Symmetry: C6
Subunit: 219 residues, 6 copies
């Protein structure tokens, strides 16, 4: 990654063993559960494109997912190239060349070039650009691997309401419902899919009930 | 987080793998037992709003709780906006814009803006403001998930007094009794809910007994 | 805590995840065995009052003990206030206010105030003052939770002498005998409570025997 | 390794215990699964040739592989010597000698010489040169230890499509198919080797289907 | 401990959680096996007397040993006081007082005084002095807890010679034989205590055999 | 060890708990398997003689090996003294004395002297000299503890060739065959000791086959 030292200049540091191991293990333990994404983003704070490739490449399973991710990355790279075409022909001696999609994705750029872009004034933030493409890809994967439709999350006759809501919102997160929909579901699908007893209590609370109020009601 | 380097300027550091892992694991092991809150506060020492979101987002279960927390955060954000309305229309070139509720909660502000606020002279402490909202939310959750009323904590006939008081005060903490009430209960509910034998000893000590004195008495 | 950076000024650092975890785990594993106290003292080296509260608050069990500790802290705070009354009425603009008991215990003071006191020239060492109160409290707890009187530590007929002395001194430590008494017991209670065979050997060594000499004798 | 200190000069640091242990353990757990290579590359970020030898030498098993790697390294060294012959006869007093193949591989050069080369202006990057030779060798090993031809990866009658694609791409990675071939296989061998039911669905999608589309289709 | 910062002045650092935990665990796992001593010495590199007390106090078992150690420390302290008597009466304002035995052992000196002594020019190395007393004490303990005389280490009829020599030298180390005796035993007791078969081979090698030669002979 | 700080001067640092623990554990787990040696060398990067003694002394078993190592060290020390005799009689006030063998081995020199030698301009590298003696000793031990002659490594009738070559080269490493012999064995003993079926294939490849070619052939 690129970090500020204790004196305030932006320099390259090696990715740490603790970072490498954290990411491998989270993938091992959680696969593409949705909370893996924010972990990825945090573990790659300051990453160069080289670093981002390192983290993805150190993953041993999930190779169907990694191939899908490559496809997504190529799509975004191709759109970058449409928006930001680069000059063919030789570089001005000693000067910074402009990055193409494949330079952002780290496949045609050197570590030195990446550093040069990211520490330019002002920065050409190739690490952040590539990270956004990667996350775009990873979210598609999360959605793909989500095993259950929200329509099939229904409260069991003996299932505590709390346990049911946990299942409901865990499913909506993986299915990647917007926050509008997450904020709205509380007045609709969450009640409809509740068991008869709690459905009756919830119906009676009336509209505009907070989730806290609904959960208290069905305790 | 924002830290002082070894030379005394306030700079942004990446959230560490050890921090990320600590929080995930405490949640995994303790859920919303009350001691989780002070751990959260300590693990997020110096956090930006981005960092606070990271820590909350890396939590994989408890999604009913995380939705309730969003609701709390929106409420506080809306109150911030009532108290501190911001100018519509374009920013003075190169100048710091004022933060709205959603900028404090990190949903409409960039990391760079957050840093700018938090390292201004004097600071607009957006990390601390958002942390307070989050903790407000988390305490509601603790109270919600508290499984037992203090009225149902009664000393067993063979239950050592110490074990009973531990249960009593653990329950009061989760139910979020004030310190007035915690300091007062020792002369009332704690005696009433004791077993017959210890109740008799405690009754005889007379009023004004310390908890240490009560515990010694029923040893 | 407050630390010296690599350049020699006194600055605030976040309490580390390793520190937080160390303390929680020592409490989990050892409860209020006496060696917990020196661990507490070492883990809170440089602590502000905020830090000390953090460490105590992160403890999930032992709530009877934590309530007793609050009582002790209030007692010491009240004695501080008797010895060092503070001016009512408004603070001199920009100047340091004097700390009350509850400011030392971190309940009415901000982190910024605490830092200001502790890094004043010369320091008002609020972290060390509060730590002493806490330890005073913790020692009471150790003594309370000590399960056995020294009078009931007697050497078994087949019990190796070494194992017996270990039990003896472990018990005296928890019961909080002075070092005078620890240094004296070797000529008295330790012999009296030994088994017949070793009692005879010890009696014959005569007075002024070191513990090393006594232990060699009964090997 | 050679690192930038907090002041911006290039200096030698000892290889860390965490690094040493990481590499030994990844080899212990994964042998020459393909994801071991990018881990090696990341764990040896900034390595001198001495460091690279350390990491290889600390491996206790896999000695057939380590012998094959020596052979590869000798081959590359011999090609370096063909391209970059060095002056026989004595060194200019106080001046930097040019590196031979065996100096790059760390077998005839001292740590001091290695440092001198790598921190020259401009650097003679002996660590990166040797790392490339090592990786060249390691990839041969991965391919050698790959247990299954891609022709034998066929979807089971009850095998979920996702699980089959994971097997397929894991195998192609170890067999070291190019990215052209990985990007192409999706329209050919992957369909042919699918089970009858999914083969029919895939055939009907038509050509130009993304892997995401294929995977959705056979869900 | 007292350390050199990154700028070259001698300053006080907090004892680390990793250090505290290392020592507790080595004692837990190895008790007073002889190799515990060099671990103690290394873990307390740079220690103040306060730090040394911390490490000893954090030990929960072995209280007979800790009492014996106190006795040893008092003996050395008393000898220090005989050799280096201090002026009674008040300290020169602002000046360094001379350390008594109990100031070296950290029982009558403050951390600030300890630091003042240890960073004086030239240093009064109170940490190293106290460490020597402690080690003197610990060696007595090792010897006390050594379970077997060297006279009872005899090679079994089916016991490999190597395993026998390991037992022999492990025992001599705990019994604290000098290096003269360790270097000499190879020509005497080690042969005498060997089994008949290896005794015959060893006898025939003749005098002046190295341990390597003896071990090869009885392989 | 002696390290470069973040400002570029050579200073003494305490050996870390992580280093101490790494070495003890590698010895516990691997004994004197050959890969232990390069681990030792790496873990003692920058070591003073004091540090080297620490690492050796913290080893609790293998005392026959540690005695043999002492003997080796005395031999090298005695040869140093033959080559580099030192002046008897008093040191020039304030000046650096020359190191004898026992000063290099850390038995008659102080830490301060060691530091003085190692940070002299130019350095008298006593840490590296002693490390070489130690490694010389350790290699003898590896060879001694090697359980099997290369003549007894023969391929089983159902033993995969790869598994056989691993056994072969693991044995040659412990027996400490030169690289000439390791590079040569592939055309001789490795074929002769192969099973009949693979022996026939190998014989037919003809001379000059790489190990990669041989291994492919017998797959
Ligand atoms: C066809 C294509 C698309 C995108 C990439 C980017 N990329 C790398 O360069 C790399 O080393 N590993 C990667 C792992 C997983 C996804 C993309 C990776 C490569 C090839
Ligand atoms: C409707 C609404 C309210 C509050 C927030 C703040 N927030 C984030 O921005 C985020 O990334 N994760 C969060 C996790 C748990 C609670 C609030 C989070 C978002 C949306
Ligand atoms: C009545 C009373 C007495 C003392 C304290 C001090 N104190 C805190 O402020 C805190 O946050 N946690 C604490 C945990 C355990 C003991 C005292 C704590 C609070 C209340
Ligand atoms: C014949 C030959 C070729 C290459 C090398 C390079 N090399 C080292 O120097 C070393 O110490 N360990 C190594 C481990 C595994 C591969 C090559 C190593 C040595 C000998
Ligand atoms: C009578 C006497 C002798 C020596 C000491 C020194 N000492 C401490 O001060 C301490 O806090 N813990 C200690 C643990 C184990 C041995 C000596 C310790 C105290 C008392
Ligand atoms: C007779 C003799 C030879 C060599 C040494 C060097 N040496 C130490 O000084 C030490 O403290 N531990 C050591 C452990 C294992 C080998 C040599 C050690 C001492 C004595």
């Amino acid at each position: 990654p690129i970090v500020q030292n204790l004196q305030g200049q932006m320099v390259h540091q090696c990715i740490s063993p603790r970072t490498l191991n954290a990411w491998v293990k989270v993938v091992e333990e959680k696969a593409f559960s949705p909370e893996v994404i924010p972990m990825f983003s945090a573990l790659s704070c300051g990453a160069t494109p080289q670093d981002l490739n390192t983290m993805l490449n150190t993953v041993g399973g999930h190779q169907a997912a990694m191939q899908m991710l490559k496809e997504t990355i190529n799509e975004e790279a191709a759109e970058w190239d449409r928006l930001h075409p680069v000059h063919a022909g030789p570089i001005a001696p000693g000067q910074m060349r402009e990055p193409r999609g494949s330079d952002i994705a780290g496949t045609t750029s050197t570590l030195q070039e990446q550093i040069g872009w990211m520490t330019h004034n002002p920065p050409i933030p190739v690490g952040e650009i590539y990270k956004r493409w990667i996350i775009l890809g990873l979210n598609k994967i999360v959605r793909m691997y989500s095993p259950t439709s929200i329509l099939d999350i229904r409260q069991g006759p003996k299932e505590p309401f709390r346990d049911y809501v946990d299942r409901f919102y865990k499913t909506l997160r993986a299915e990647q419902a917007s926050q509008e929909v997450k904020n709205a579901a509380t007045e609709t699908l969450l009640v409809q899919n509740a068991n008869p007893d709690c459905k009756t209590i919830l119906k009676a609370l009336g509209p505009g009930a907070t989730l806290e109020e609904m959960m208290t009601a069905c305790q």
